[PDB]
């Protein structure tokens, strides 16, 4: 099936530049127009622009034409977004999308770009251990910028999982917890590992959680 995977999101200083990439699979990329859409945290969707297959037509929303340059590499089935001199108002999740029919039928999961004068910091990962139903988890502490992704048992465990929205601590660093409820009889039996990924700092941590 059609797959759209964005990468490159992280911390950008105000006035800074960054290039995003959208790697595709499951379709002949060279035959399709491609687009970018953004969404500021807790806000609406904003169309950035589109590129036709041979790159002869590139259209942008007028208010953002200075901040963005759209390009593509048909040989690599990759869409790019060159971000220029970003502002605090440009903090958003950036989605690559595929137009079809004037509708966008496929969307990537998006990549978050944070525009801030602070510094990047990887998280510390700690177990939340239990002692009919039991709960366990992982505490993902002191990171910047957002986001962190958490999976359980490399994605084999999904039912009963709750990954909480991050909280901004007094230190200006983020923290979140990911929890899962399981049968209590499985505590001695099954292995539980949370897989934490913080792409902005290239931090990957696998933490075994034992009672």
């Amino acid at each position: 099936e059609v797959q759209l995977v964005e990468s490159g999101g992280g911390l950008v200083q105000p006035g800074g530049s960054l290039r995003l990439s959208c790697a595709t699979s499951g379709f002949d990329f060279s035959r399709y127009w491609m687009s970018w859409v953004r969404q500021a945290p807790g806000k609406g969707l904003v169309w950035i622009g589109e590129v036709n297959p041979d790159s002869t037509s590139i259209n942008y929303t007028p208010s953002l034409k200075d901040q963005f340059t759209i390009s593509r590499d048909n040989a690599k089935n990759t869409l790019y977004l060159q971000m220029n001199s970003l502002r605090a108002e440009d903090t958003a999740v950036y989605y690559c999308t595929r137009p079809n029919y004037y509708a966008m039928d496929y969307w990537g999961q998006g990549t978050l770009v944070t525009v801030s004068s602070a510094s990047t910091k990887g998280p510390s990962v700690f177990p939340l251990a239990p002692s009919g139903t039991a709960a366990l988890g992982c505490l993902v502490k002191d990171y910047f910028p957002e986001p962190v992704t958490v999976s359980w048992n490399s994605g084999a465990l999904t039912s009963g999982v709750h990954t909480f929205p991050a909280v901004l601590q007094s230190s200006g660093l983020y923290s979140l917890s990911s929890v899962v409820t399981v049968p209590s009889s499985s505590l001695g039996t099954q292995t539980y590992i949370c897989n934490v990924n913080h792409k902005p700092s290239n931090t990957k941590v696998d933490k075994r959680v034992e009672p």
Binding site: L45, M104, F164, S177
Partner: protein, 213 residues
């Protein structure tokens, strides 16, 4: 640029309800109107295109109507998996523009939380910090009170709460309350407890542990 306005901006409805959302365009866009659904923590998904055409694999309960400047999106019978923010999008003139979204929430019966307490790990303690976590799992309504008790006495420390969005299967919420203390302060007390008050609980529920046990 064509301005797209949605109404209501937010609504609560019950499973089984017919739900109708409107979209109005600043100028005539003929029938070039699309609807997207965005589930919590997920990317938008195309539901309806060209005002009334269902996209491939979209449930028959979703429909669209209108023309010119006024459009309607209807869910014939609301399902728990329909919890989302819905957006309209005009495709008549460049730049393509979206409505501000309609956040659809679900009203359901009271569900009491299941409560769990977690001590700080020995790994975190070695670093100089102690975070104590109280989990309130799968409850409804969103309103809940969590109180930290240290040695059966009320503690007025640094505690922060986080709440999930409504679950797509049972429309419940979960909440975490995290008490952060320095290792030195964590060691000034023995019993750590979190006391929970919620509409589904006839009397408050306490979960506790003894430091070192």
């Amino acid at each position: 640029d064509i301005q797209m306005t949605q109404s209501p901006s937010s609504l609560s409805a019950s499973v089984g309800d017919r739900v109708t959302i409107t979209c109005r365009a600043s100028q005539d866009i003929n029938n070039y109107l699309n609807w997207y659904q965005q589930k919590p923590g997920k990317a938008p998904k195309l539901l309806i295109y060209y005002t009334s055409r269902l996209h491939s694999g979209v449930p028959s309960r979703f429909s669209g109507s209108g023309s010119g400047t006024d459009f309607t999106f209807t869910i014939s019978s609301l399902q728990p998996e329909d919890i989302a923010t819905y957006y309209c999008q005009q495709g008549s003139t460049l730049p393509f523009t979206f409505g501000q979204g309609t956040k659809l929430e679900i009203k359901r019966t009271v569900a009491a939380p299941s409560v769990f307490i977690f001590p700080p790990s020995d790994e975190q303690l070695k670093s100089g910090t102690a975070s104590v976590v109280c989990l309130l799992n799968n409850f409804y309504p969103r309103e809940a009170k969590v109180q930290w008790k240290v040695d059966n006495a009320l503690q007025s420390g640094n505690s922060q709460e986080s709440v999930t969005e409504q679950d797509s299967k049972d429309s419940t919420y979960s909440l975490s309350s995290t008490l952060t203390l320095s290792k030195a302060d964590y060691e000034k007390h023995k019993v750590y407890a979190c006391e929970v008050t919620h509409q589904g609980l006839s009397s408050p529920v306490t979960k506790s542990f003894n430091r070192g046990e």
